[PDB]
Write a protein that binds this DNA or RNA. Sequence first.
RNA 1: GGCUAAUCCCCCAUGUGGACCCGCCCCUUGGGGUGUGUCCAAAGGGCUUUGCCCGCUUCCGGAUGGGCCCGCGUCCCAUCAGCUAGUUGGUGGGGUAAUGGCCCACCAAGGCGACGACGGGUAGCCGGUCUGAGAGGAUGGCCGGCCACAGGGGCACUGAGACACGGGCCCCACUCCUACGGGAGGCAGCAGUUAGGAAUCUUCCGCAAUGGGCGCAAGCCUGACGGAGCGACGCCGCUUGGAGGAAGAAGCCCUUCGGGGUGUAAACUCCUGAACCCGGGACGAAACCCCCGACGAGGGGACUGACGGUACCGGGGUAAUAGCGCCGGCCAACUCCGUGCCAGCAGCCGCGGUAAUACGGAGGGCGCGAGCGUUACCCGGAUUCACUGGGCGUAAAGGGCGUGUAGGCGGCCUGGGGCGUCCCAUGUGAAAGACCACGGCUCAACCGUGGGGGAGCGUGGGAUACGCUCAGGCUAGACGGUGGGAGAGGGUGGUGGAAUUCCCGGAGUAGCGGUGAAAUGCGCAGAUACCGGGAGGAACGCCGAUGGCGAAGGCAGCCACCUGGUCCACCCGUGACGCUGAGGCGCGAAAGCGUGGGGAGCAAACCGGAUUAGAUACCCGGGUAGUCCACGCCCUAAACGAUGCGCGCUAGGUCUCUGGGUCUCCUGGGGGCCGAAGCUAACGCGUUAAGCGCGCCGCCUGGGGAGUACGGCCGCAAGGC
RNA 2: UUCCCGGGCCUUGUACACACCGCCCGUCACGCCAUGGGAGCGGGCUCUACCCGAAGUCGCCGGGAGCCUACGGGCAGGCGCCGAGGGUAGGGCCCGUGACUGGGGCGAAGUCGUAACAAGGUAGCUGUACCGGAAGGUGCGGCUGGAUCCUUUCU
Lengths: 138, 124
Amino acid sequence: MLTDPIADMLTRIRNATRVYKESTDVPASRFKEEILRILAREGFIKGYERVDVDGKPYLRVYLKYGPRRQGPDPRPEQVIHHIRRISKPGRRVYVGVKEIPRVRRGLGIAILSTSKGVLTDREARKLGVGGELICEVW
Amino acid sequence: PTINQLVRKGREKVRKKSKVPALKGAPFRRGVCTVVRTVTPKKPNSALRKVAKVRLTSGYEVTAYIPGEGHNLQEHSVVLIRGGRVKDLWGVRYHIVRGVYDAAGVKDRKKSRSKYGTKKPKEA
RNA sequence: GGCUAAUCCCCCAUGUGGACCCGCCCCUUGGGGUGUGUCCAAAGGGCUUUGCCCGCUUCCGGAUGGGCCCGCGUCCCAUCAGCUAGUUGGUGGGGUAAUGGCCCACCAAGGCGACGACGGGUAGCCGGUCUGAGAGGAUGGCCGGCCACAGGGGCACUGAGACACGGGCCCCACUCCUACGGGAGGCAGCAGUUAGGAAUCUUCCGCAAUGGGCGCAAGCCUGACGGAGCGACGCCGCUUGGAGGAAGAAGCCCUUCGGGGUGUAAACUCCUGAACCCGGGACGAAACCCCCGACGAGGGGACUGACGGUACCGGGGUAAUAGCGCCGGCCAACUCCGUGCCAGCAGCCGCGGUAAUACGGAGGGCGCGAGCGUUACCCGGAUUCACUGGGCGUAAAGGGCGUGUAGGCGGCCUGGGGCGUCCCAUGUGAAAGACCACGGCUCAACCGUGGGGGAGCGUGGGAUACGCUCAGGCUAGACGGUGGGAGAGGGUGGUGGAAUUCCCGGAGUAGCGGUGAAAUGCGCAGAUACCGGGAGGAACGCCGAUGGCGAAGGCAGCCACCUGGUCCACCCGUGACGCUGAGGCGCGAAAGCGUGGGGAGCAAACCGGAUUAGAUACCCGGGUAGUCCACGCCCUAAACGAUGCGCGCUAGGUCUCUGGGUCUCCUGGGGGCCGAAGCUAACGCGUUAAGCGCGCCGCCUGGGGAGUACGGCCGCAAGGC
RNA sequence: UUCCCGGGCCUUGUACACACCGCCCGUCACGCCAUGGGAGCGGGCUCUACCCGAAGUCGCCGGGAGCCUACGGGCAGGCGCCGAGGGUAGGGCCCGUGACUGGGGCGAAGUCGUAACAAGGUAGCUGUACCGGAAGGUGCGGCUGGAUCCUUUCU
Ligand SMILES: [Mg+2]
Ligand SMILES: [Mg+2]
Ligand SMILES: [Mg+2]
Ligand SMILES: [Mg+2]
Ligand SMILES: [Mg+2]
Ligand SMILES: [Mg+2]
Ligand SMILES: [Mg+2]
Ligand SMILES: [Mg+2]
Ligand SMILES: [Mg+2]
Ligand SMILES: [Mg+2]
Ligand SMILES: [Mg+2]
Ligand SMILES: [Mg+2]
Ligand SMILES: [Mg+2]
Ligand SMILES: [Mg+2]
Ligand SMILES: [Mg+2]
Ligand SMILES: [Mg+2]
Ligand SMILES: [Mg+2]
Ligand SMILES: [Mg+2]
Ligand SMILES: [Mg+2]
Ligand SMILES: [Mg+2]
Ligand SMILES: [Mg+2]
Ligand SMILES: [Mg+2]
Ligand SMILES: [Mg+2]
Ligand SMILES: [Mg+2]
Ligand SMILES: [Mg+2]
Ligand SMILES: [Mg+2]
Ligand SMILES: [Mg+2]
Ligand SMILES: [Mg+2]
Ligand SMILES: [Mg+2]
Ligand SMILES: [Mg+2]
Ligand SMILES: [Mg+2]
Ligand SMILES: [Mg+2]
Ligand SMILES: [Mg+2]
Ligand SMILES: [Mg+2]
Ligand SMILES: [Mg+2]
Ligand SMILES: [Mg+2]
Ligand SMILES: [Mg+2]
Ligand SMILES: [Mg+2]
Ligand SMILES: [Mg+2]
Ligand SMILES: [Mg+2]
Ligand SMILES: [Mg+2]
Ligand SMILES: [Mg+2]
Ligand SMILES: [Mg+2]
Ligand SMILES: [Mg+2]
Ligand SMILES: [Mg+2]
Ligand SMILES: [Mg+2]
Ligand SMILES: [Mg+2]
Ligand SMILES: [Mg+2]
Ligand SMILES: [Mg+2]
Ligand SMILES: [Mg+2]
Ligand SMILES: [Mg+2]
Ligand SMILES: [Mg+2]
Ligand SMILES: [Mg+2]
Ligand SMILES: [Mg+2]
Ligand SMILES: [Mg+2]
Ligand SMILES: [Mg+2]
Ligand SMILES: [Mg+2]
Ligand SMILES: [Mg+2]
Ligand SMILES: [Mg+2]
Ligand SMILES: [Mg+2]
Ligand SMILES: [Mg+2]
Ligand SMILES: [Mg+2]
Ligand SMILES: [Mg+2]
Ligand SMILES: [Mg+2]
Ligand SMILES: [Mg+2]
Ligand SMILES: [Mg+2]
Ligand SMILES: [Mg+2]
Ligand SMILES: [Mg+2]
Ligand SMILES: [Mg+2]
Ligand SMILES: [Mg+2]
Ligand SMILES: [Mg+2]
Ligand SMILES: [Mg+2]
Ligand SMILES: [Mg+2]
Ligand SMILES: [Mg+2]
Ligand SMILES: [Mg+2]
Ligand SMILES: [Mg+2]
Ligand SMILES: [Mg+2]
Ligand SMILES: [Mg+2]
Ligand SMILES: [Mg+2]
Ligand SMILES: [Mg+2]
Ligand SMILES: [Mg+2]
Ligand SMILES: [Mg+2]
Ligand SMILES: [Mg+2]
Ligand SMILES: [Mg+2]
Ligand SMILES: [Mg+2]
Ligand SMILES: [Mg+2]
Ligand SMILES: [Mg+2]
Ligand SMILES: [Mg+2]
Ligand SMILES: [Mg+2]
Ligand SMILES: [Mg+2]
Ligand SMILES: [Mg+2]
Ligand SMILES: [Mg+2]
Ligand SMILES: [Mg+2]
Ligand SMILES: [Mg+2]
Ligand SMILES: [Mg+2]
Ligand SMILES: [Mg+2]
Ligand SMILES: [Mg+2]
Ligand SMILES: [Mg+2]
Ligand SMILES: [Mg+2]
Ligand SMILES: [Mg+2]
Ligand SMILES: [Mg+2]
Ligand SMILES: [Mg+2]
Ligand SMILES: [Mg+2]
Ligand SMILES: [Mg+2]
Ligand SMILES: [Mg+2]
Ligand SMILES: [Mg+2]
Ligand SMILES: [Mg+2]
Ligand SMILES: [Mg+2]
Ligand SMILES: [Mg+2]
Ligand SMILES: [Mg+2]
Ligand SMILES: [Mg+2]
Ligand SMILES: [Mg+2]
Ligand SMILES: [Mg+2]
Ligand SMILES: [Mg+2]
Ligand SMILES: [Mg+2]
Ligand SMILES: [Mg+2]
Ligand SMILES: [Mg+2]
Ligand SMILES: [Mg+2]
Ligand SMILES: [Mg+2]
Ligand SMILES: [Mg+2]
Ligand SMILES: [Mg+2]
Ligand SMILES: [Mg+2]
Ligand SMILES: [Mg+2]
Ligand SMILES: [Mg+2]
Ligand SMILES: [Mg+2]
Ligand SMILES: [Mg+2]
Ligand SMILES: [Mg+2]
Ligand SMILES: [Mg+2]
Ligand SMILES: [Mg+2]
Ligand SMILES: [Mg+2]
Ligand SMILES: [Mg+2]
Ligand SMILES: [Mg+2]
Ligand SMILES: [Mg+2]
Ligand SMILES: [Mg+2]
Ligand SMILES: [Mg+2]
Ligand SMILES: [Mg+2]
Ligand SMILES: [Mg+2]
Ligand SMILES: [Mg+2]
Ligand SMILES: [Mg+2]
Ligand SMILES: [Mg+2]
Ligand SMILES: [Mg+2]
Ligand SMILES: [Mg+2]
Ligand SMILES: [Mg+2]
Ligand SMILES: [Mg+2]
Ligand SMILES: [Mg+2]
Ligand SMILES: [Mg+2]
Ligand SMILES: [Mg+2]
Ligand SMILES: [Mg+2]
Ligand SMILES: [Mg+2]
Ligand SMILES: [Mg+2]
Ligand SMILES: [Mg+2]
Ligand SMILES: [Mg+2]
Ligand SMILES: [Mg+2]
Ligand SMILES: [Mg+2]
Ligand SMILES: [Mg+2]
Ligand SMILES: [Mg+2]
Ligand SMILES: [Mg+2]
Ligand SMILES: [Mg+2]
Ligand SMILES: [Mg+2]
Ligand SMILES: [Mg+2]
Ligand SMILES: [Mg+2]
Ligand SMILES: [Mg+2]
Ligand SMILES: [Mg+2]
Ligand SMILES: [Mg+2]
Ligand SMILES: [Mg+2]
Ligand SMILES: [Mg+2]
Ligand SMILES: [Mg+2]
Ligand SMILES: [Mg+2]
Ligand SMILES: [Mg+2]
Ligand SMILES: [Mg+2]
Ligand SMILES: [Mg+2]
Ligand SMILES: [Mg+2]
Ligand SMILES: [Mg+2]
Ligand SMILES: [Mg+2]
Ligand SMILES: [Mg+2]
Ligand SMILES: [Mg+2]
Ligand SMILES: [Mg+2]
Ligand SMILES: [Mg+2]
Ligand SMILES: [Mg+2]
Ligand SMILES: [Mg+2]
Ligand SMILES: [Mg+2]
Ligand SMILES: [Mg+2]
Ligand SMILES: [Mg+2]
Ligand SMILES: [Mg+2]
Ligand SMILES: [Mg+2]
Ligand SMILES: [Mg+2]
Ligand SMILES: [Mg+2]
Ligand SMILES: [Mg+2]
Ligand SMILES: [Mg+2]
Ligand SMILES: [Mg+2]
Ligand SMILES: [Mg+2]
Ligand SMILES: [Mg+2]
Ligand SMILES: [Mg+2]
Ligand SMILES: [Mg+2]
Ligand SMILES: [Mg+2]
Ligand SMILES: [Mg+2]
Ligand SMILES: [Mg+2]
Ligand SMILES: [Mg+2]
Ligand SMILES: [Mg+2]
Ligand SMILES: [Mg+2]
Ligand SMILES: [Mg+2]
Ligand SMILES: [Mg+2]
Ligand SMILES: [Mg+2]
Ligand SMILES: [Mg+2]
Ligand SMILES: [Mg+2]
Ligand SMILES: [Mg+2]
Ligand SMILES: [Mg+2]
Ligand SMILES: [Mg+2]
Ligand SMILES: [Mg+2]
Ligand SMILES: [Mg+2]
Ligand SMILES: [Mg+2]
Ligand SMILES: [Mg+2]
Ligand SMILES: [Mg+2]
Ligand SMILES: [Mg+2]
Ligand SMILES: [Mg+2]
Ligand SMILES: [Mg+2]
Ligand SMILES: [Mg+2]
Ligand SMILES: [Mg+2]
Ligand SMILES: [Mg+2]
Ligand SMILES: [Mg+2]
């Protein structure tokens, strides 16, 4: 059992991209699908596919990065520079609407689960709802 | 600590002990001199430092420093304890305020006169 | 003892109505209605005297103020771990405005506690305030709200209300009066005194205002209050002048003796006019009251100041207080002289032992300025208790290891609920304060008016992603089945050879042993070296590893029994059954303890021989406990990977142990070495993380004092926690 | 080229850095200081059992033993429960004082050694155990945080 599945996703992504892997698999949940879909829509991943590994469902996340660079260390600027959990089991964090973070001066996002569904901080504010603060990406 | 651990045990606020029991929380205590003597200072220096054993209104006997050049104090003179200690001296935790009670100020001192308790002289 | 009035007490009546028993009805804890029965009312006074007033009585509402009850929040110590006899409930009753063990009687045997009861310590609580970027920390003077007390302790009486600060009773301590029988007090009201203390004010003015009590009023009372006084205690406003004035006086300081500095600073010229003198002179005050009207609405009229001749306006008018800290670094400001580890400085670092920007003075300078410093204390910096926002291989810090209790945490899909979560409305969130705006004292301080915001909690409504719950599915976790393994994993029995020591015997003879060198010691009663035989105790050479097993401690000859863990394969069963774990419990090297055994070698202590200046040692010869067994204690450790457990994720290379596979090699599970990314203070770690993440436990907060003291708990003790 | 002296290069351990003529441990004696523990006394608060008990409310009596009476009852008075406080015996806390005392600081590093740091000259450290003027030595077991592959103190 993963204790936090959602984190395990976020991290799978973290390590994945930090080696510039082209794609990575995470065990599939509809919720994870949702989170992903937000990233995709926000330009953070390339997109993802539902897929099958040894007959068990995964979602395959295809990662994007910047150009190649010059000087020593040609390695590309990450597109997800930073991705982290906020709510975790065993400390659950919920913001009301007025308490919804703005992130990296607007240049980042926060993904909240709400009774209106999974939305970006901007999305949630425009919808005028709060909820469980799932993670921040930038 | 886990968060749950903090919810259980918490964090310990840490208190500081007062460098001065002039008690009362008071800024000064009055006392009487007991012994007025001289003492040699700690390892890095040498001098003869002037001190009084004082018996305070606050019930305590304490050694106090007598700052400045000259001094008039002797066995029965009553004095004011202002606190702040002397570093290169053994167990001297407070200074005597000069100018108050049987402490005279420092004769002829022209310079930082309110420390040392001397009045502004006139000029010609 | 006698007389007497009333709005004082009583009796009979009237019964709008109300109270009480009982019945019914509605409503639902004792709310409302109704019926019979019983019980219950009153007080007069004034006049502009046939009506009006101020009152009285019963009842129903209102308003205002309260009582009681509940959810939640509300300091420190667990070195306080158990507390409980009206204690916990029940019935009946007493008591009250009212619920209630509030109190009593009888009955039952309960109630509370690691979600911290009980105990100890401290403490009025709050609106707010201080600080902080915030989160947070600290605080609760003044003003407003609540509580509690009124010399200490109890108690009730009157009353709508008290268990009453200037009411009552009693006990106690104290003061005072006394004719010694007995009495009188109670400033934590305003002032004031005294004591204590570093320290906190006038025995002022006034009832004019606002407010309060009584009165139909006129009024009376009001140390509530409105004012004044003292204190640089705070805050704000303002003064000690403004303009000109030298290549720049004297004095003083420095000087390379040329000069530099204080410096336009002074002197001086002109101007303004704090102080102060004169004249005017408030607002706050219009009611109550009187008059018309109707004692109403409305209209008209009169009186009334403590602050105070104050503020303010007008006139006149004098160049009119500056001080304190500092100038080594942090920190803005440097030179001379004096002093010579002295005298002294000092917040830390540290200055002073003859060239001192660090002591002391001076010149100069920096900073604030009617202040400036100091002391104390709070927040700050301190991300140094880390929620925001720290950590634990070697810096402080992983529990010696396990088992699991509470508790924390919980894979994939579906549906219901909608508790957490989120949203809308609403109620509350007093005033003051904070904030914004306009405004009023010439400004400000201070003050007024308006506005905004807002956590929390109550109610109604809504959402359902996530968290929970219920229901129902799944198999990727977990366990199980079958099959194949490896192993010093454990307990009990047995049993095998090598060596040591001893005994017996043979043969053999002058030494052996031991050291740097020696000696002690042993040997002619025949040792050492050699052969044979017996006894006994302990430990298992080679295999053996750079190996394996185990949670740890630890575990090595062979055999049998008993028994624990574990890896792989097949993908068969269960279907989330999962991870962690305070406490508890169990285990726990060595040494040590108790009882009884055993005792070959070794060996603390000890006995000797050496060495040394000594030698309570290192070296040599002996040797007791012990080392071994059984049973019972002990609970420690460099109990070391100095690295908690579990899971998921992140290049490889190479060596190995053990499975499976089409057996260059591949695929699991362990052990090693280099190393990607990455981490790290470095050293180093790196799919056996010290990397990236989640869950949970343990622990850390400078060194010494100190693993000490005290307390408690273990233990036979030693000692442990 | 072993040894003595001086020296060069590489490497290694270090707790040295006025740098091995370096660093550094413990015991002792008598002063003086400020702490901490502390029997015995002295004061306080508290709790338990027992005995005494004001005031007051409540309960009962209230009687040819008092007052009023419309004879219904009322008052006085008495008695009892509770009860502030007091007494005796005890457990606990706190304050004061205090005999006696542990460890520390200053005298002076004074004294004896030389235990640790370099292979510290017997590698160290460690739990334990015995022993010794003292650092310490020794036994057992453990650790690496151990160098390299005669004895001979101090500065
Ligand atoms: Mg909210
Ligand atoms: Mg010096
Ligand atoms: Mg004198
Ligand atoms: Mg200070
Ligand atoms: Mg000075
Ligand atoms: Mg009479
Ligand atoms: Mg008469
Ligand atoms: Mg009647
Ligand atoms: Mg009627
Ligand atoms: Mg009733
Ligand atoms: Mg009446
Ligand atoms: Mg009448
Ligand atoms: Mg009310
Ligand atoms: Mg009782
Ligand atoms: Mg009954
Ligand atoms: Mg009852
Ligand atoms: Mg009662
Ligand atoms: Mg009453
Ligand atoms: Mg009864
Ligand atoms: Mg009873
Ligand atoms: Mg609870
Ligand atoms: Mg108290
Ligand atoms: Mg108090
Ligand atoms: Mg407090
Ligand atoms: Mg903080
Ligand atoms: Mg706050
Ligand atoms: Mg508070
Ligand atoms: Mg006050
Ligand atoms: Mg006051
Ligand atoms: Mg108040
Ligand atoms: Mg009282
Ligand atoms: Mg008094
Ligand atoms: Mg008293
Ligand atoms: Mg009283
Ligand atoms: Mg009344
Ligand atoms: Mg009262
Ligand atoms: Mg009074
Ligand atoms: Mg009164
Ligand atoms: Mg009396
Ligand atoms: Mg008198
Ligand atoms: Mg009086
Ligand atoms: Mg009296
Ligand atoms: Mg007074
Ligand atoms: Mg005095
Ligand atoms: Mg006053
Ligand atoms: Mg008066
Ligand atoms: Mg008045
Ligand atoms: Mg009035
Ligand atoms: Mg009236
Ligand atoms: Mg009249
Ligand atoms: Mg009159
Ligand atoms: Mg009067
Ligand atoms: Mg006043
Ligand atoms: Mg004064
Ligand atoms: Mg003064
Ligand atoms: Mg001012
Ligand atoms: Mg001019
Ligand atoms: Mg000109
Ligand atoms: Mg000049
Ligand atoms: Mg001049
Ligand atoms: Mg000159
Ligand atoms: Mg020259
Ligand atoms: Mg000149
Ligand atoms: Mg001028
Ligand atoms: Mg001129
Ligand atoms: Mg003039
Ligand atoms: Mg005038
Ligand atoms: Mg007026
Ligand atoms: Mg007027
Ligand atoms: Mg009047
Ligand atoms: Mg008129
Ligand atoms: Mg008329
Ligand atoms: Mg009239
Ligand atoms: Mg009128
Ligand atoms: Mg009028
Ligand atoms: Mg006047
Ligand atoms: Mg006047
Ligand atoms: Mg005029
Ligand atoms: Mg004027
Ligand atoms: Mg002038
Ligand atoms: Mg002038
Ligand atoms: Mg000045
Ligand atoms: Mg410096
Ligand atoms: Mg400054
Ligand atoms: Mg400077
Ligand atoms: Mg001198
Ligand atoms: Mg000189
Ligand atoms: Mg000098
Ligand atoms: Mg010098
Ligand atoms: Mg100087
Ligand atoms: Mg200085
Ligand atoms: Mg100076
Ligand atoms: Mg000066
Ligand atoms: Mg100056
Ligand atoms: Mg000040
Ligand atoms: Mg303060
Ligand atoms: Mg502070
Ligand atoms: Mg901060
Ligand atoms: Mg600190
Ligand atoms: Mg830190
Ligand atoms: Mg944190
Ligand atoms: Mg830390
Ligand atoms: Mg950790
Ligand atoms: Mg290492
Ligand atoms: Mg450590
Ligand atoms: Mg461990
Ligand atoms: Mg477990
Ligand atoms: Mg459980
Ligand atoms: Mg579940
Ligand atoms: Mg779930
Ligand atoms: Mg659960
Ligand atoms: Mg649902
Ligand atoms: Mg809901
Ligand atoms: Mg809605
Ligand atoms: Mg609202
Ligand atoms: Mg309200
Ligand atoms: Mg609200
Ligand atoms: Mg408000
Ligand atoms: Mg204001
Ligand atoms: Mg604001
Ligand atoms: Mg204005
Ligand atoms: Mg606010
Ligand atoms: Mg608020
Ligand atoms: Mg609701
Ligand atoms: Mg729904
Ligand atoms: Mg299910
Ligand atoms: Mg199946
Ligand atoms: Mg099997
Ligand atoms: Mg086979
Ligand atoms: Mg075995
Ligand atoms: Mg075996
Ligand atoms: Mg023989
Ligand atoms: Mg023979
Ligand atoms: Mg011989
Ligand atoms: Mg021998
Ligand atoms: Mg012989
Ligand atoms: Mg012989
Ligand atoms: Mg012989
Ligand atoms: Mg012979
Ligand atoms: Mg023989
Ligand atoms: Mg023979
Ligand atoms: Mg033989
Ligand atoms: Mg034999
Ligand atoms: Mg034998
Ligand atoms: Mg045998
Ligand atoms: Mg064995
Ligand atoms: Mg091994
Ligand atoms: Mg081991
Ligand atoms: Mg088996
Ligand atoms: Mg198996
Ligand atoms: Mg299956
Ligand atoms: Mg099935
Ligand atoms: Mg589920
Ligand atoms: Mg445990
Ligand atoms: Mg068990
Ligand atoms: Mg053991
Ligand atoms: Mg043993
Ligand atoms: Mg034994
Ligand atoms: Mg024997
Ligand atoms: Mg010997
Ligand atoms: Mg020697
Ligand atoms: Mg000697
Ligand atoms: Mg000898
Ligand atoms: Mg020996
Ligand atoms: Mg022998
Ligand atoms: Mg031997
Ligand atoms: Mg024995
Ligand atoms: Mg023994
Ligand atoms: Mg790869
Ligand atoms: Mg094979
Ligand atoms: Mg491997
Ligand atoms: Mg490596
Ligand atoms: Mg690297
Ligand atoms: Mg890190
Ligand atoms: Mg590096
Ligand atoms: Mg792996
Ligand atoms: Mg590998
Ligand atoms: Mg391992
Ligand atoms: Mg891991
Ligand atoms: Mg680390
Ligand atoms: Mg700290
Ligand atoms: Mg300390
Ligand atoms: Mg210990
Ligand atoms: Mg204690
Ligand atoms: Mg003890
Ligand atoms: Mg224990
Ligand atoms: Mg015992
Ligand atoms: Mg011990
Ligand atoms: Mg040489
Ligand atoms: Mg060379
Ligand atoms: Mg070389
Ligand atoms: Mg080198
Ligand atoms: Mg040497
Ligand atoms: Mg004592
Ligand atoms: Mg005691
Ligand atoms: Mg009694
Ligand atoms: Mg009562
Ligand atoms: Mg009774
Ligand atoms: Mg009769
Ligand atoms: Mg009678
Ligand atoms: Mg009668
Ligand atoms: Mg009586
Ligand atoms: Mg009694
Ligand atoms: Mg009593
Ligand atoms: Mg010390
Ligand atoms: Mg001593
Ligand atoms: Mg010494
Ligand atoms: Mg040694
Ligand atoms: Mg040595
Ligand atoms: Mg050694
Ligand atoms: Mg040696
Ligand atoms: Mg040796
Ligand atoms: Mg020895
Ligand atoms: Mg040892
Ligand atoms: Mg050993
Ligand atoms: Mg260490
Ligand atoms: Mg070592
Ligand atoms: Mg070795
Ligand atoms: Mg030598
Ligand atoms: Mg020496």
